[PDB]
């Protein structure tokens, strides 16, 4: 329903890690099946979407005018849906890397120009879809993308894990500032 965040996660945790972070920030969240149709999300009145993780998802989750945070595989899909491409197996090993961050991007507000983040082995963006800016990187590796007018944001790394030093700040930026979720409950 309204004011809540829907989590579509293709990974081994089935939304649980991302869901604990959203809870910790006092925001209502529902873990949904990844193939949940975009129209169903709109009809329920969800305020935002977090997609993370070949599994089938509805490409229209990116096109319905709701704020979306794509994490890792979710960022790759976001890029793909808007005409971008990816490198296969470009990240060979899991690691905690210091990366360059665009500080003026909505998502990375309050961060330093350099940040320590967890990147998992796998794929990474090649050609960046038109309308997206690169907002984080290390070398050939695009670590973040943003279409600010559309409120579509991608992070290659995993902000939901404590190993990403200021991952909570990134999620706060998305949920509060970008999506306008209130971090308040009524007891």
Swiss-Prot record:
Subunit structure: Homodimer.
Catalytic residues identified in the record: 72 (for gatase activity), 158 (for gatase activity), 160 (for gatase activity)
Subcellular location: Cytoplasm, Cytosol
Origin species: Homo sapiens (Human)
Glutamine amidotransferase type-1 domain sequence ranges: 4-184
Pathology linked to this chain's protein: A chromosomal aberration involving GMPS is found in acute myeloid leukemias. Translocation t(3,11)(q25,q23) with KMT2A/MLL1.
Function: Catalyzes the conversion of xanthine monophosphate (XMP) to GMP in the presence of glutamine and ATP through an adenyl-XMP intermediate.
Residues of the full protein shown: 25 to 219 of 693
Lineage: Eukaryota, Metazoa, Chordata, Craniata, Vertebrata
Protein's name in the database: GMP synthase [glutamine-hydrolyzing]
């Amino acid at each position: 329903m309204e004011g809540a965040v829907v989590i579509l996660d293709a990974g081994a945790q089935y939304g649980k890690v991302i869901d604990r972070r959203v809870r910790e920030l006092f925001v209502q969240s529902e873990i949904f099946p990844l193939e949940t149709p975009a129209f169903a999300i709109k009809e329920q009145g969800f305020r935002a979407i977090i997609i993370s993780g070949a599994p089938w998802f509805d490409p229209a989750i990116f096109t319905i005018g709701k704020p979306v945070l794509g994490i890792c595989y979710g960022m790759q899909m976001m890029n793909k849906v808007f005409g971008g491409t990816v490198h296969k197996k470009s990240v060979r090993e899991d690691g905690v890397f210091n990366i360059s961050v665009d500080n003026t991007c909505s998502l990375f507000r309050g961060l330093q120009k350099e940040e320590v983040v967890l990147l998992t082995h796998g794929d990474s963006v090649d050609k960046v879809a038109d309308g997206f800016k690169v907002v984080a990187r290390s070398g050939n590796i695009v670590a973040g993308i943003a279409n600010e007018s559309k409120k579509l944001y991608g992070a290659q790394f995993h902000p939901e894990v404590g190993l990403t030093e200021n991952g909570k700040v990134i999620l706060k930026n998305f949920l509060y500032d970008i999506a306008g979720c209130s971090g308040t409950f009524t007891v």
